[PDB]
Amino acid sequence: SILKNQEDTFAAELHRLKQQPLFSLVDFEQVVDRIRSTVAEHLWKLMVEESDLLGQLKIIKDFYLLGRGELFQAFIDTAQHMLKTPPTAVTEHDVNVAFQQSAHKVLLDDDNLLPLLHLTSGWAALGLSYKVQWPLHILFTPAVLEKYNVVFKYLLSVRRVQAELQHCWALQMQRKHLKSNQTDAIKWRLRNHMAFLVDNLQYYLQVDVLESQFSQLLHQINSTRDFESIRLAHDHFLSNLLAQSFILLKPVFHCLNEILDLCHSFCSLVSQNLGPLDERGAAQLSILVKGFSRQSSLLFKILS
Amino acid sequence: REIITLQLGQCGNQIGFEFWKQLCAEHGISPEGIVEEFATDRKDVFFYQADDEHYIPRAVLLDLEPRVIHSILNSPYAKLYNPENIYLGNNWASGFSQGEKIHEDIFDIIDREADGSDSLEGFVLCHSIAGGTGSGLGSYLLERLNDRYPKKLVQTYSVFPNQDEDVVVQPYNSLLTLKRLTQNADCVVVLDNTALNRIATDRLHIQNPSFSQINQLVSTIMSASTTTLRYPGYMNNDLIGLIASLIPTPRLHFLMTGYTPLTTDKTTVLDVMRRLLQPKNVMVSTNHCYIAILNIIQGEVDPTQVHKSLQRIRERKLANFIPWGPASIQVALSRKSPYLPSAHRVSGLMMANHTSISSLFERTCRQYDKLRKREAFLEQFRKEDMFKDNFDEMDTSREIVQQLIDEYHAATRPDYISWG
Amino acid sequence: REIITLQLGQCGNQIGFEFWKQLCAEHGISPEGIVEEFATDRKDVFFYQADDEHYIPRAVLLDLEPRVIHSILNSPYAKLYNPENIYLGNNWASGFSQGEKIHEDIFDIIDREADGSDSLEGFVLCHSIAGGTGSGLGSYLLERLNDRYPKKLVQTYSVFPNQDEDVVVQPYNSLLTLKRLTQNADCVVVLDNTALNRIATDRLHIQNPSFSQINQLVSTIMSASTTTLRYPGYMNNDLIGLIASLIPTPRLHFLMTGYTPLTTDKTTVLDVMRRLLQPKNVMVSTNHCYIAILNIIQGEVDPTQVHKSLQRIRERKLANFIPWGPASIQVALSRKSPYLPSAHRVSGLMMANHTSISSLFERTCRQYDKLRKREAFLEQFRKEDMFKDNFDEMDTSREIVQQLIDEYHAATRPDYISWG
Amino acid sequence: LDGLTLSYKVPWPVDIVISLECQKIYNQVFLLLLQIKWAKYSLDVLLQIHRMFLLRVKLMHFVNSLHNYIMTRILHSTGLEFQHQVEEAKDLDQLIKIHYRYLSTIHDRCLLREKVSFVKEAIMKVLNLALMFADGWSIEKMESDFKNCHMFLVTILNKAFPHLESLALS
C-alpha cells in the first residue's frame, strides 16, 4: 500500500545509519517508531471500515454478552430436556435444530445464520460458537471467544433463575384468584419476594456493568487509530468485565453460588408442589429459611 | 409475548383508537397498514402480519348503543385493522344485562383471534368506570375471560370518575365494578380525571377542549408503558416481567402513573427521577408510603451517572418505603422512540404501589353510604329489579371493598406480618 | 399432449375467444396466424401447423341463438383459426332438447378434427352454469363425448352463478348440470362470480364494466393453468400429470383457483406461497381443511430458498390438511412468459381440493328445496313437459347431489376409511 | 426397467475432453430417473373397492414427494450451479476439474456410490408396491408390506450426508 510507496525512504534511513561512523540506539528507535505508526494505522483503517468492526461488536454484545433477552428466554423455555441428563449423542445437534426453528417464528428469521450452538446436567452445558471473518479480523482469537464464553454462562444463569421466580408466582394467577384458601400452610412467610430481590438486584447491577463497559469501549476505539493500541483496550475491557461481574472465584462468588443453588431448590419444591399443603414440604422450608438468613449474613461480612 | 387489546365503552374505544393511532405514528408504517420502505425495532409486538407490508393490529373493538364509534369508524385509521368485529341506558345493570345475552358471539369473535394468535401473553382492557354502557358490560366480560382463561393475564386501563361534580348512581356503578376489579382482574392501572384536569389547566388555560388534550397525556403514558416491549430492551420485555415486582400481593395491585413534563406544548436522570418522586408531577392525585416503585427512562444515556444518581436519590431522603419489607424504587432505561419528531427527548414514567388511593375509595364508599341511606339514588329501573329484587349484591360489594380498605390500612402499618 | 378446446354458450365463447387471444399475445405470433420472424418455446401445444408460419389453433366454437357470437365473429382474431365450424329459450331443457336433434353434425365436426389430430390428450369445456342456452346443451354434449370417448380426459371451466341476486329456474339448471358434472366429467375448475366481483371492487371501484375486468382475471388464471405445458417444464407438462395428485377420488375432483396480486392496474416465493394460503387472495370464496394442494410459481428463481421457504410454510402452521392421509401442498416452478410485457414478474397459482364448496352446493340445494316446495319456479314450458311429464329426474338429481354432500362431509371427518 | 444403452457421437476436439466413464455415469443416472418415471406414470395410468382409494392416496403422494426431492434439489440445483461454474472456467485443466467435481457430487447426492445395500434397497422394495397396485383393478397384504417397509425406511433415515435431513419430513 503506502508502506510499499515509501519503502525506499525506509531503506534510505537504514542505509543512512549504515553510512554513519557512529551508531546510536536513540536514533534507531525513532526510525522503528515512525514506521510503526503508519503500518499500525493502515490495518486499523481497513478493519474498522471494510471489515465493519464497529457494527460487528454491537452484534457480539447482543447475542453473546446477552444484549438481547427475547431469544434467550424463550429458548430456555423451549429447551426443557436440559433438565435431564444428556446422552450427548442426540442432544448436541438437537439444540441447534431447536434454536434455528425457534428463531424462525418471529424476529431474525433469515439474517445471520452464522452462529452455532454447542454443548459444554444440561444447564451446566449449552455454550456458543461464533464464526467471524478470519482474514479480516485477527484481534478475534480463541482466547477471546473463551473469555467471552465464561461470561456467557454466568449471564445465562441469572436470566435462568429469574424466569423460575416469575413462573413460580402462579400464586397470583390461579391460587389467589377466585381463591383465598386459609393460612399457615398457604403462607410460607412469603419469602418468594425477598429472594426475588436478591436476584433482581444482581440483574440491575449487571445492567449498569455491561452498559458502562460497552459504552467506554466504543468510545475508545474512535480515538485509538493504531492497531497495536486497540489490543490493550480489548484486553482491558474483558478483564474489567470479569471482576465486576464477580466471575473470579472470591468468597462472594461462593456466596452467590450458594444463593443460586438454594433458590433453585426453593423453586423446585413449589413447582412440583401442587394445590398447596404440607406434603413434608415444611421440613425443607425450615432448612431453607435458616440457610437463606445465614447466607445473606455473609454478604454483610464485607461492608467497610 | 402477544397481547390482544380489548376496548369497550365510548371513552374506552376513544383511547383504543388513540393508542393504536399513536402506535401507527411511532412505528414506520402508513395509516393504511402499509409498512414504510424507508425503514432495528420490532413491529410485531401486537400485529398480525399480512403480506402487503401489512402488520394488521390485533385489537377487538366493542360497542353498546354506539354514538362515538361511528365517528371512530369514518377514518383513515380504520383501514389499519378492523377484521369486521363491530357489534352493537347508562346504568351498570344496563350494560351487564345487555352483555348477558350476547356474550357468546362476542366471545366467538374473541376465540377467532385466539386461535388466530399463535403466541399470547395477556388481554388489555380499555375501560371507563361510570361510563354508562361500559359499566356492567366490562365487568361481565371481565368475569367471562377470567372464567375461560386461568392461564392468561389481564390489565385494565380505567378512569377514576371524579370531576368535582347529574348522575347519582355513579358510586353504585363504581362500587360494583371495583368489586369485579379487585377479584377478577390481575392488573389495574388507575388515573384521576381530576388530576389530569389539573395538569391540563396547568399546561394551558382550557376548560372546554379538555378531552383531546387528555388523549395526548394518556397516549404518552400508554406508549411509555409499552416502549420496553415494542423496542428491544432487556428486562420487562414481557408484561409479566414488568408486573411481578409491582404486585407484592393481589390485594395490592393498583398501579400509579407518571410523566415528567408538565407542559408539552443537560437535565440528568436524577432530576426527572427526583421530580417523578414529587406528587405535583404524578398524574394521579397519617403518612402514606410507597410499597414498591419502578421507574422507566427513555432518552439521553449517561452510562455512569445512573448509579451516581442512585446514591443521590438514596441520600436525598424524599421517599421512605414500606417498613416490613425490602422495597426499592427501581430503574429501567429504554431507547427513545424513532420514526417520529419528539419534544422532551428525556421522558420518564413511574409504576408504583401507594396507599393514597384508599382515600379515594373511602370517598366513594362514604358517598355510596350517604346516597344509599338517603334512598333516592338507585333510580329504580327494571334492569336493577330483574338483576336483584332485594339489592343485597351492592351491600356485599360494599362489604368486600370495606374489607379491602381494612387490608389497605393494615398494609399501611409497619406490621403486616399477621393477616388483616 | 394435444387438447381440443370446446366452447359453447355466450359466456363460454367469450372466455374461449379471450383465452385464444391471450395465447396469441403470449406466443410470438400475429393475430392473423402468421408466426413472427423475430422469434426456445413450443407453439404447437394446441395448434395445427399450416405453412405460412401458420399454427392454426385447434378450437371448436359452438353457438345457440347467437348474439355475442356475431361480435366475436367480426374481429382480427377470427383469422387465426375458424375452420368453418359455426353452427346455430334460456332454460336447461331448451339447450338440452335443441342439442338432442343436432348432436350428429356437431359431433361430425368433432370427428373431423379428431382424425385431424394425430395426438390427443383431452377436451376442455368452456362452460357457463345457468347461462341459459349453454345449460342443458353443454351437459348433453358432455354426456355424448363421455359416451364416445372412454379413453380421453375432460376438464370444464365453468362459472358458479352467484351474484347475490330475475331467473327463478337457476337452482334447477345448476342442480341438473352439476349432476352431469359429477358423474360425466373428469375434471372441474370452479370459480365464484361473487368472489371475482369482490376482487374487481377491490382493485378498482367499478360496478358496471365488471365483465371485461373479469375477463382479465380469468385469462390470467387460464394462462397460468397452461404455462407448464406451453413452455417446457419438467413435470405436469401433460394434463394428467397435473391432474393425478389433485384428485384422490372422483367424488373429490373440484379444483380451486388463485392469483397472487389483488390489483394489477424482493418478494420471495415464501410470501406469495403464504398469502396464496390466505382466503382473501383465493379467487373462489366447523373447520374446512384442504385435501391436497398444488402451487405453481412463474418468475424469479431463488435456487435454495425454495426448500428454506418449504421449511418455513411447514413451521408457520397456517394450513392443517386432511387427517386420514399424507396430504401436502406441493411446489411447481415454471418460466415466466416471454414475448409480452408483464407487470408482477412473480405470479402464483393454486390448485387444491377443499371442502368449503359443499356450503355453496347446499346453498343451491336449500334454494332449490324452497322453490320446489313453493311450486311457482319451474316455469312450466313445453320443453320441460316433453323432457319429463312427472319431473322426477330433478328429484333424482337432488338426491345424488345430496349424497355427494354427505360424501363431502364424511370426507371432512378424520375417518373416511369406511365408505360414506 | 433395465437394459437400454443409448450412445451419442461427439467430435474429437471435445471427445478428448469428456471421458468415456462420464458417458457411463450419465447412463447410470438415467436408469435412476427411469425408475421414478416408471412409478409415477404407473400410478398415473389408473383412473370393498374404495379401499384402493386409500391405497392410491397413500402411495401416489409418497412417490411424488420422492420425485420432488430427487429431481429438483439435486438434478436441477447442481445443473444450474454447473452452468455458472463453467462460464467462469478459464483453463483447459480446470474445466475438466470442475466437470469431474460436478459428477462426483451429483453421483453422491443421488446415492450411486457407497451404502447402496443399506439405503437404496428401501427405494428398491417400494417400487414393487407400484407393481402390485397396478395389478389390482390381496389388498390388505400390500398395506401390510407398506407399513413395515415404510417404518424400516424411516428408522434408517433418522441417522445423519448431513443433507439427509432435507428429505426427513415424510
Describe this entry's structure for a reader.
The PDB classes it as cytosolic protein. Chain A has 304 residues and is mainly alpha-helical. Helix content of chain A is 65%, strand content 2%. In chain A, a hairpin with an 8-residue loop joins strand 1 and strand 2. Chain B contains 13 helices and 11 strands. In chain B, the strands form 3 sheets. A 6-stranded parallel beta sheet of chain B has the order 4-1-5-6-7-8, sandwiched between helices. In chain B, strands 10-9-11 form a 3-stranded mixed beta sheet, sandwiched between helices. Chain D is mainly alpha-helical and 170 residues long. The A-C interface holds A 101, 104-105, 109-110 and C 308, 311-312, 315.
SSE inventory with pairings:
This is part of a larger assembly, with one copy of chain A (304 residues), two copies of chain B (420 residues) and one copy of chain D (170 residues).
Chain A: H1 2-5, H2 7-19, H3 25-49, H4 53-64, H5 70-77, H6 91-104, E1 116-118, E2 127-129, H7 142-168, H8 171-175, H9 192-223, H10 227-244, H11 251-272, H12 281-298
Chain B: E1 3-7, H1 10-26, E2 47-49, E3 55-57, E4 59-61, H2 68-73, H3 92-116, E5 122-126, H4 134-148, E6 153-160, H5 170-184, E7 187-192, H6 193-203, H7 210-230, H8 239-246, E8 254-255, H9 269-276, E9 290-298, H10 305-316, E10 329-334, E11 347-354, H11 357-374, H12 382-387, H13 393-412
Parallel strand pairs in B: 1-4, 1-5, 5-6, 6-7, 7-8, 9-10
Antiparallel strand pairs in B: 2-3, 9-11
Helix pairs in contact in B: 1-7, 3-4, 4-5, 5-11, 5-13, 9-10, 11-13
Chain D: H1 12-15, H2 20-42, H3 51-86, H4 92-109, H5 120-135, H6 140-157
PDB class: cytosolic protein
Keywords: Assembly, Intermediate, Complex, cytosolic protein
Entry title: Structure of recombinant human gamma-Tubulin Ring Complex 10-spoked assembly intermediate (spokes 3-12, homogeneous dataset)
